[PDB]
Amino acid sequence: LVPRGSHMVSCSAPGKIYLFGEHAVVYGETAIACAVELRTRVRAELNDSITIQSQIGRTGLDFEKHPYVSAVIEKMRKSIPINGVFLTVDSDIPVGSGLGSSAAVTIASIGALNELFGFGLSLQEIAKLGHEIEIKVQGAASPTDTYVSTFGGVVTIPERRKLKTPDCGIVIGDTGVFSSTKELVANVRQLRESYPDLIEPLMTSIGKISRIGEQLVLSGDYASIGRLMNVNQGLLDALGVNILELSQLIYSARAAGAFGAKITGAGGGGCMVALTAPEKCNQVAEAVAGAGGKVTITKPTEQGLKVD
């Protein structure tokens, strides 16, 4: 094959929302993720030393300001030497939120170095490597985020089967309220401990939504996907992870015609998501904006990691 050893290479990897079933996976259940068109992009250039540039600054190998890129380099250079590289990182995935910001930079960086230095990694090896980098950086991590970012589209969890991509707009509304992903996993579990006979069946019912929903994703019945999303949001409210500002955004989106709307990610703050007809995306976005949410307008993405 054609040498490309000096070719500047850019890779991108998407963030993701949950159609159903966040919070339920740890307790054995099925969920359905959808990658979206908000990407982190990483361009890799041959260089005499290691330089990493992003909105945070220009560094060398710096595990404090550039933890993920730095960990990727540290791990891959054990296989094939990396004498030098200039990496430039830019992201359209909103700073913090279950949308997969650290998984996207991890996967894009692996992609870009894979290409530039010829590691010949397949997508499955990339996903597993990414998972490994998040463990190294965070202490402990679920493989789901790096897998969805790698392969893109709609993915059932944890069987990892690809479902047809819906032709819908996605509005993300950020409440601007901070919450700890650990503290909320901690409270779901606790309420679960105090009333086991009540809370266990609820996770079971969220699991059921994905099984019903799989079938609606296949037939493109977005109106029913939306009705289920709404049911799932109510189950999340029963689990204790909703707040007033999330309901505020959710109810505006629904009133403006969204198929459905729900928390995406851990809850307690952060973002909600609305699934809309493409021709109604703007109107839902304006209603969420009107209500004070920080709005991003996006759509599902068919591809995961890609050489741009």
Known binding residue 108? Answer is: no
- Scan residues 251-280 and list those touching a second copy (CB under 8 A): 251-252
Name which position in 155, 236, 256, 272 contacts a second copy (CB under 8 A).
236
Choice between 103 and 203, CB closer to Mg ion? 103
Q: Which of 145, 167, 221, 237 is catalytic?
A: 145
Q: Using CB distances below 5 to 8 A depending on partner kind, what does residue 231 bind out of a second copy, Mg ion, none? A: a second copy
Work out whether 42 is an interface residue with Mg ion (CB under 5 A).
no
Figure out which of the listed residues 66, 131, 254, 262 binds Mg ion, where binding follows CB under 5 A: 66
Q: How far is the CB of 63 from Mg ion (least distance, A)?
A: 9
Q: Is 104 annotated as a binding residue?
A: yes
Q: Rule CB under 5 A: say whether 69 interacts with Mg ion.
A: yes
145 given a catalytic annotation:
yes
Beta carbon nearer to Mg ion, 16 or 66: 66
Contact of residue 248 among a second copy, Mg ion, none (CB under 5-8 Å per partner type): a second copy
For the chain, give the secondary structure using H, E and C.
Answer: CCCCCCCCEEEEEEEEEEEECCCCHHHCCCEEEEEEEEEEEEEEECCCCEEEEECCEEECCCCCCCHHHHHHHHHHCCCCCCCCEEEEEEECCCCCCCCCHHHHHHHHHHHHHHHHCCCCCCHHHHHHHHHHHHHHHHCCCCCHHHHHHHHCCEEEECCCCEECCCCCEEEEEECCCCCCHHHHHHHHHHHHHHCHHHHHHHHHHHHHHHHHHHHHHHCCCHHHHHHHHHHHHHHHHHHCCCCHHHHHHHHHHHHCCCCEEEECCCCCCCEEEEEECHHHHHHHHHHHHHCCCEEEEECECCCCCEEC
- Shortest Cβ 303–a second copy spacing (Å): 31
Annotated binding site for ATP: 94-104
User: Which positions are annotated as active-site residues?
Assistant: 145
